[PDB]
C-alpha cells in the first residue's frame, strides 16, 4: 500500500505530462490546419480569376475567327 | 483501501491505453497533414505555370488583333 500507491503517482505524473504536450501539438496542428484552409481559398480565388481571364481569350479568339473569315471570303469574291 | 486503489489502477490502465492510440492517430494525421501541405504547393505551382501559359495566349491574341486589323485597313484603302 505504501510504495504501491507510489507507482500509481508516477504513472499519473508521466501521464499528465503526456497529456500536456499533446495539448500543445494539437495547438500547433490547429493553426496549421487553419492556415491550410485559408490558402485553399486563395488558390480557389486564383482559379476563379484565371478562368475569368480564360473565358475572355476564348471570346477574343472567337471574334478573330470571324474577323479573318470575313477577310478571306471577301478576297475570294475579288 | 485494498480493492479501492485497485479501481484506480484500472482507470490508469485504460487511460494509458487511450493515450496510446491517440499518440498514434496523431501520427497518422500528421503525415497526412504533411502530404496535404506538399500537394497545396503542387497545385499552386500548377496554377503559376498555367497563368504563364495564359499570359502568353492573351499576348498572341493581342498581336493577332493587330495583324488582322492592318489587313482590314489595307483592303479598305484598295
Amino acid at each position: 500500500i505504501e510504495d504501491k500507491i507510489e507507482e500509481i503517482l508516477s504513472k499519473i505524473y508521466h501521464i499528465e505530462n503526456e497529456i500536456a504536450r499533446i495539448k500543445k501539438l494539437i495547438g500547433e496542428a490547429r493553426q496549421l490546419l487553419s492556415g491550410i484552409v485559408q490558402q485553399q481559398n486563395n488558390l480557389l480565388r486564383a482559379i476563379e480569376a484565371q478562368q475569368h481571364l480564360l473565358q475572355l481569350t476564348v471570346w477574343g479568339i472567337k471574334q478573330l475567327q470571324a474577323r479573318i473569315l470575313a477577310v478571306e471570303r471577301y478576297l475570294k469574291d475579288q | 483501501i485494498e480493492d479501492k486503489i485497485e479501481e484506480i489502477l484500472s482507470k490508469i490502465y485504460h487511460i494509458e491505453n487511450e493515450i496510446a492510440r491517440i499518440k498514434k492517430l496523431i501520427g497518422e494525421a500528421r503525415q497526412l497533414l504533411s502530404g496535404i501541405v506538399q500537394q497545396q504547393n503542387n497545385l499552386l505551382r500548377a496554377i503559376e505555370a498555367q497563368q504563364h501559359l495564359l499570359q502568353l495566349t492573351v499576348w498572341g491574341i493581342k498581336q493577332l488583333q493587330a495583324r488582322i486589323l492592318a489587313v482590314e485597313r489595307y483592303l479598305k484603302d484598295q
Binding site: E28, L32, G35, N42, A46, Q50, L56 | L33, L44, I47
Partner: peptide, 29 residues
C-alpha cells in the same frame, strides 16, 4: 479584357507566402 491579371499576381504572391509559412509550421510539429 489592371483587371484580372494584376489580381492573379496578387493571389499567387499571396498564395506563395502562405505555402511558405504552412510548411514552416508543419516542420515545427
Amino acid at each position: 479584357x489592371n483587371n484580372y491579371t494584376s489580381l492573379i499576381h496578387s493571389l499567387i504572391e499571396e498564395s506563395q507566402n502562405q505555402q511558405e509559412k504552412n510548411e514552416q509550421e508543419l516542420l515545427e510539429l
